[PDB]
Amino acid sequence: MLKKKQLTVLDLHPGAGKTRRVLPEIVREAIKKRLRTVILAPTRVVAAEMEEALRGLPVRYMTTAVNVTHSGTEIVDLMCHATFTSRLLQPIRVPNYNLNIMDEAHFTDPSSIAARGYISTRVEMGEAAAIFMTATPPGTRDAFPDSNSPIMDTEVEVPERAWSSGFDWVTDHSGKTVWFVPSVRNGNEIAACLTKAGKRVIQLSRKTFETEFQKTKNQEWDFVITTDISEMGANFKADRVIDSRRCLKPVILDGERVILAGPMPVTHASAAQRRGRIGRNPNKPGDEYMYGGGCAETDEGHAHWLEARMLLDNIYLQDGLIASLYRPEADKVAAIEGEFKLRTEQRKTFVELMKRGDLPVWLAYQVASAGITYTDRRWCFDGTTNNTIMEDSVPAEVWTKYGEKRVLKPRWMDARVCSDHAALKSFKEFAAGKR
Numbered sequence: 455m456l457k458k459k460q461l462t463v464l465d466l467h468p469g470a471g472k473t474r475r476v477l478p479e480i481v482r483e484a485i486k487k488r489l490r491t492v493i494l495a496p497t498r499v500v501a502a503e504m505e506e507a508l509r510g511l512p513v514r515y516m517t518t519a520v521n522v523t524h525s526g527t528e529i530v531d532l533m534c535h536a537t538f539t540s541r542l543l544q545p546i547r548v549p550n551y552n553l554n555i556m557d558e559a560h561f562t563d564p565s566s567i568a569a570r571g572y573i574s575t576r577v578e579m580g581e582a583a584a585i586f587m588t589a590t591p592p593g594t595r596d597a598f599p600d601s602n603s604p605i606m607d608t609e610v611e612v613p614e615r616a617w618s619s620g621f622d623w624v625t626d627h628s629g630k631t632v633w634f635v636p637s638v639r640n641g642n643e644i645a646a647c648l649t650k651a652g653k654r655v656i657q658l659s660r661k662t663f664e665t666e667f668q669k670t671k672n673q674e675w676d677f678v679i680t681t682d683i684s685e686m687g688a689n690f691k692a693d694r695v696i697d698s699r700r701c702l703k704p705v706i707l708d709g710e711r712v713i714l715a716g717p718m719p720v721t722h723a724s725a726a727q728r729r730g731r732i733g734r735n736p737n738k739p740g741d742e743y744m745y746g747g748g749c750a751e752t753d754e755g756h757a758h759w760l761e762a763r764m765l766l767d768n769i770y771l772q773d774g775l776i777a778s779l780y781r782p783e784a785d786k787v788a789a790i791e792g793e794f795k796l797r798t799e800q801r802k803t804f805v806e807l808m809k810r811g812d813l814p815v816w817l818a819y820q821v822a823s824a825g826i827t828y829t830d831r832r833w834c835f836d837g838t839t840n841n842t843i844m845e846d847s848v849p850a851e852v853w854t855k856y857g858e859k860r861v862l863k864p865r866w867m868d869a870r871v872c873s874d875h876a877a878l879k880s881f882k883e884f885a886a887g888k889r
């Protein structure tokens with residue numbers, strides 16, 4: 455795998471030991487061969503798990519989730535998928551790693567797709583070797599892969615709202631359950647219904663992941679209500695996975711706006727990843743997997759593949775060349791390589807709106823490509839009436855940096871900035887000039 459010009463896909467089934475057994479072996483061999491190596495973790499929780507697995511080995515942890523200071527003699531760096539893409543975008547010089555290892559290489563966030571495209575272009579160019587570690591590589595059609603112990607699979611109607619009757623099997627369980635819901639808002643309703651019936655619930659989402667996940671290990675619980683984020687390495691000591699098999703799809707309508715379509719079916723990779731959370735202990739067979747719909751290839755036409763092209767177009771590779779997306783996923787979007795390449799000063803705005811402004815990729819590109827400087831927020835208020843952001847079924851209001859009260863009405867509308875109370879609270883601070 456380590457020899458140059460080779461992209462290796464390590465597709466061992468969920469729970470085989472790719473992060474606690476296979477990864478330290480590759481690292482020892484890379485250190486022995488003097489290969490400058492990068493290890494890419496999907497999340498900060500998985501970076502702290504990789505540290506336990508690699509403890510003792512000379513690894514430089516370029517993450518605040520690991521409290522280890524480095525000796526300076528390290529040739530292996532460990533960082534998140536987003537961190538890698540972020541430094542490629544920023545004027546910081548990234549070493550030309552001889553070996554690139556991506557764990558959970560199935561992650562569909564725009565920064566993970568872009569990192570796969572950048573790394574695979576380098577392998578294609580004959581400049582590096584790479585290992586993509588995932589039970590579900592891009593293109594997998596098996597939602598029921600092999601496991602460490604037998605799993606009871608059951609097609610069942612799974613509730614997506616609070617209930618007063620008809621779903622006894624959900625509450626008549628004396629064990630631990632990981633329930634994959636389509637959205638934070640859908641999960642809040644089910645969590646409230648389970649709490650009312652006397653259950654201890656923990657809710658996990660992208661924004662709360664490195665705070666609430668610790669609660670699964672520290673306190674007793676009955677259910678974990680989670681979105682698709684727990685598909686990327688999150689391990690639990692549970693005996694049941696309830697899977698709605700639904701998810702929200704960010705879609706770009708007429709190149710003018712972004713909506714959150716669905717709930718709609720998850721891909722086979724996501725259904726396999728969600729089921730893979732159980733059936734992991736060979737001494738405890740009979741972990742149940744209750745699924746509530748079918749699978750469809752909803753990754754085609756999804757905004758993350760377009761956003762990844764927006765990132766890759768603004769990353770230097772070699773002269774005027776631009777990195778292509780990783781081949782098994784290059785057709786999920788219809789895009790010309792280079793069409794989103796911004797000029798030097800606008801690219802600087804694009805990066806800041808994402809890193810400091812915390813705006814979704816698509817939205818950041820809309821603003822930066824219009825010649826708007828980072829701190830200019832007039833666009834948050836000069837959109838049409840249909841772009842009015844509503845909070846509590848009434849127009850949201852912010853105090854502008856000028857001391858004036860205004861209705862939130864953005865020139866470009868992206869549903870991700872107001873898909874829950876936390877996203878809208880964060881966007882209101884942005885529109886007010888607070889960051």
Ligand SMILES: CN(C)S(=O)(=O)c1cccnc1
Binds near residue numbers: 467469471473589590
């Ligand atoms: C094998 N590893 C434990 S892992 O965390 O890389 C993983 C887990 C489940 C599915 N795919 C990969």
